[PDB]
A paper describes a structure:
Biochemical assays, site-directed mutagenesis, and X-ray structures of mutants of human Polλ incorporating sequence determinants from P. tetraurelia [name] or metazoan Polβ are used to investigate the origin of their fidelity. To further probe this mechanism, we engineered and purified five mutants of human DNA polymerase λ, the closest relative of Ptet-[name], targeting residues that contribute to the induced-fit mechanism of Polβ or that are suspected to contribute to a similar mechanism of Ptet-PolXs. These constructs also included the following mutations to facilitate crystallization and diffraction: Δ1–241, KGET, and C543A. Because we could not crystallize P. tetraurelia [name] itself with various DNA substrates, we set out to crystallize mutants of human Polλ incorporating sequence determinants from P. tetraurelia [name] or metazoan Polβ: these structures indicate that a Loop3-based fidelity mechanism is incompatible with the fidelity determinants of Polβ, which is based on a large conformational change (open-to-close transition).
Additionally, two mutants were generated to incorporate Ptet-PolXs-like features into Polλ: Polλxt-K (I492K) and Polλxt-K-SD2X (which also carries E529D, mimicking the SD2 motif of Ptet-PolXs, SDH). These mutants were designed to assess whether Polλ’s enzymatic behavior and structure would be affected similarly to Ptet-PolXs. The Polλxt-K mutant, designed to mimic the putative Polβ-like induced-fit mechanism of Paramecium [name], exhibited kinetic behavior similar to λref, particularly in kobs, but with a 3.8-fold lower KM, suggesting increased nucleotide affinity. The most striking feature of this mutant is its reduced fidelity: under steady-state conditions for correct dGTP incorporation, Polλxt-K was the only mutant to display clear misincorporations and double incorporations in the 1-nt gap-filling substrate. Indeed, the lysine alone cannot ensure good fidelity, as its introduction into Polλ (Polλxt-K mutant) did not display good specificity.
Author numbering: 251 to 464, 470 to 540, 545 to 575
Write the structure that this text describes.
DNA sequence: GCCG
DNA sequence: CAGTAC
DNA sequence: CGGCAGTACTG
């Protein structure tokens, strides 16, 4: 990234817009920042900037200001509420609408939230683990967590496949959470193994809090045994074997990579989700499409006309 | 905010 | 449903 | 002008 002296400035504005609820302007800013990071050739002109995809006239003027004047004046008018809104919306379960409500009510600190705010169960758990959830763990610990869940699961059925996805699967040195995807090549055993698996993990003391409990998805909190351990975010999902590939893609991310693949699919009349890649999905402005066989991620790429990207090149 |  | 998360 | 990904728990 030869343009850090621009992305540094633009990330602040993107975050201000994001915490203040201007989701689409924040998205545009983020895509332009990805463009900047991906150029590998320091932009040294307004025409070179205005010519990069994801970067238009507004962003070109911002960048030219940063280039010549070494500073962007918009940054001097970020609302004073932004640091408080960021503090509040880093609580798991609270987003921009709750952060802004809390701000309007006069709250300015987590002590205010603790003593005065009305919290959901999820928010009370997120506040209780605030510092822990802001940390990333070494991928070695992620391995230990994956293996804990895989041992718990493979006791019910040694044929179950358990794969840790997310940044872990993209090969990052640290991970903000662990996301375990479970399936069985038999196609008809992933029923009941989910509830009993969670009962097992809870009996061992491994699971400490539940955030979301659905028929297919679990999101919660775990902690490995012993000293020097923190609480970590853990997701577990169980899927039929026929969806395994599409799950692996989706839950491996990144989020920008997925959103790009899904935009592309949408262009070619297809629809891509965590369940299936469908074709001739009818839309406008009920679209029961046809599911396409995707036994491997490579098949998803191929059906979309793309070369296969390994998980490590999927940052955006 | 960007792009069709 | 709106809000939130993935 | 208008989409910007698509799906699933909570309350
Ligand atoms: C944050 C986010 C992630 N994802 C996908 C890509 C991430 O690698 C995967 C796991 O999410 P995570 O990074 O929060 O654990 O979920 C989405 O589909 N949408 C989102 O908004
Ligand atoms: Ca991750
Ligand atoms: Ca614009
Ligand atoms: Na461009
Ligand atoms: Na939050
Ligand atoms: Na996750």
């Amino acid at each position: 990234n030869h343009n850090l002296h621009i992305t540094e400035k633009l990330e602040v504005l993107a975050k201000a817009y994001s915490v203040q609820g201007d989701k689409w302007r924040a998205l545009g800013y983020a895509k332009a920042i990805n463009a900047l990071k991906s150029f590998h050739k320091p932009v040294t002109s307004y025409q070179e900037a205005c010519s990069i995809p994801g970067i238009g006239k507004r962003m070109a003027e911002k960048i030219i200001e940063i280039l010549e004047s070494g500073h962007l004046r918009k940054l001097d008018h970020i609302s004073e509420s932004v640091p408080v809104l960021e503090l509040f919306s880093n609580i798991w379960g609270a987003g921009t609408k709750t952060a802004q409500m809390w701000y309007q009510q006069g709250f300015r600190s987590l002590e205010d939230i603790r003593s005065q705010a009305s919290l959901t169960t999820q928010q009370a758990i997120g506040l209780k683990h605030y510092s822990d959830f802001l940390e990333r763990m070494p991928r070695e610990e992620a391995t230990e967590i994956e293996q804990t869940v895989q041992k718990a699961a493979q006791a019910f059925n040694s044929g179950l496949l358990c794969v840790a996805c997310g940044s872990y699967r993209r090969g990052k040195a640290t991970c903000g959470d662990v996301d375990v995807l479970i399936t069985h090549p038999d196609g008809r055993s992933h029923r009941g193994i989910f509830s009993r698996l969670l009962d097992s993990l809870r009996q061992e003391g491994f699971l400490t809090d539940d955030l979301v409990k659905g028929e297919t998805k679990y999101l919660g909190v775990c902690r490995l045994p012993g000293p020097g351990r923190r609480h970590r975010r853990l997701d577990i999902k169980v899927v039929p074997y026929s969806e395994f590939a599409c799950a692996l893609l989706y839950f491996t991310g990144s989020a920008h990579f997925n959103r790009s693949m899904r935009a592309l699919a949408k262009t070619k009349g297809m629809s891509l989700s965590e369940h299936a890649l469908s074709t001739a999905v009818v839309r406008n402005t009920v679209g029961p499409g046809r599911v396409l066989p995707t036994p491997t991620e490579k098949d998803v790429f191929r059906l979309l006309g793309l070369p296969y990207r390994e998980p490590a090149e999927r940052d955006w």
